Amino acid sequence: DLSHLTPCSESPAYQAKAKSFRNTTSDPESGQKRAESYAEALCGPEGYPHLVVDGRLDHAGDFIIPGLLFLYVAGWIGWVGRSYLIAIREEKDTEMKEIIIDVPLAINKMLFGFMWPLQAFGEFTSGKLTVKDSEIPVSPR
């Protein structure tokens, strides 16, 4: 239940720090906005917010939402890269547009890269995502 971690509003070390939060942007009340926004976290004896990473809810915003957001964005980047790499193979001049990127193909790969997990599941169930161990270069033992 994390009795050692108190909420930052009830913690009497966070309230001493929260007066002297510096402004980060040009907004004059940015320190006060940070102070009110970090009060819902858990603070230790230092008076600083802590993040609990075990997938629980009311602390899913620490890791689960940023983690799923990164997984979507990184899957977007990797899937668009893999799609471009596959698309530039079977047209007999691949190093030149590996080094000088074909922009009209890359734009069509990028803007249609939002549906990366559906295409990933389709290629996984279709077997066209993973190359079989026979048709692949392997170093000598």
Partner 1 sequence: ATKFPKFSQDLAQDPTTRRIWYGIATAHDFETHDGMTEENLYQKIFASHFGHLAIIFLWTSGTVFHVAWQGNFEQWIKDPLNVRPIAHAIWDPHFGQGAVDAFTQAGASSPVNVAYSGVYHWFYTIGMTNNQDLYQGAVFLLILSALFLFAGWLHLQPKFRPSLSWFKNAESRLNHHLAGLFGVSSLAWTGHLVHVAIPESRGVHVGWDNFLSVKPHPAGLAPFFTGNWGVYAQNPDTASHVFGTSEGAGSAILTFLGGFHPQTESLWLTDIAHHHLAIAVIFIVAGHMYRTNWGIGHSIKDILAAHNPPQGTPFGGALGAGHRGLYDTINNSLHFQLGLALASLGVITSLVAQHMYSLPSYAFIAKDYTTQAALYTHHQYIAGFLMVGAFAHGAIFFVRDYDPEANKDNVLARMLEHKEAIISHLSWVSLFLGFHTLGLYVHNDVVVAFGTPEKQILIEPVFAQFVQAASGKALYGFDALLSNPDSVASTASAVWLPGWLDAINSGTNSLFLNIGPGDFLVHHAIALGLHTTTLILVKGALDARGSKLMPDKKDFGFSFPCDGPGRGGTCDISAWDAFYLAMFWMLNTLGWLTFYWHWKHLGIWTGNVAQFNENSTYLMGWFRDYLWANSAQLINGYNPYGVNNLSVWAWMFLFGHLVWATGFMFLISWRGYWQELIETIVWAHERTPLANLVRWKDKPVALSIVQARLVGLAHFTVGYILTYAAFLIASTAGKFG
Partner 2 sequence: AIQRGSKVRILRKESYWYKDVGTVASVDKSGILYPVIVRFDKVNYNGFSGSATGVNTNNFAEHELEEV
Partner 3 sequence: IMFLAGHFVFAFSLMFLFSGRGYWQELIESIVWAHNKLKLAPAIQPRALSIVQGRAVGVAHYLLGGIVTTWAFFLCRILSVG
Under rule CB under 8 A, residue 24 binds partner 3: no
Q: Which of 12, 92, 95, 134 binds partner 3 (CB under 8 A)?
A: 95
- Residue labelled with tokens 């942007």: 25
The least CB distance from residue 71 to partner 3, in Å, is 17
Q: Which of 89, 92, 132, 141 binds partner 1 (CB under 8 A)?
A: 141
Please give the Cα distance from 56 to 50 (Å, whole number). Answer: 14
Is residue 62 within 8 Å of residue 51, measured between CB atoms?
Answer: yes
Residue whose CB is nearest to ligand CLA in the complex, by number: 81
- Between residue 65 and residue 94, which ones bind partner 3 under the rule CB under 8 A? 81-82, 85-86, 88-89, 94
The least CB distance from residue 126 to partner 2, in Å, is 21
The least CB distance from residue 48 to partner 3, in Å, is 20
Cα–Cα distances (Å) from 102 to 85, 110, 134, in that order, read: 11, 12, 32
3-state secondary structure of 42: strand
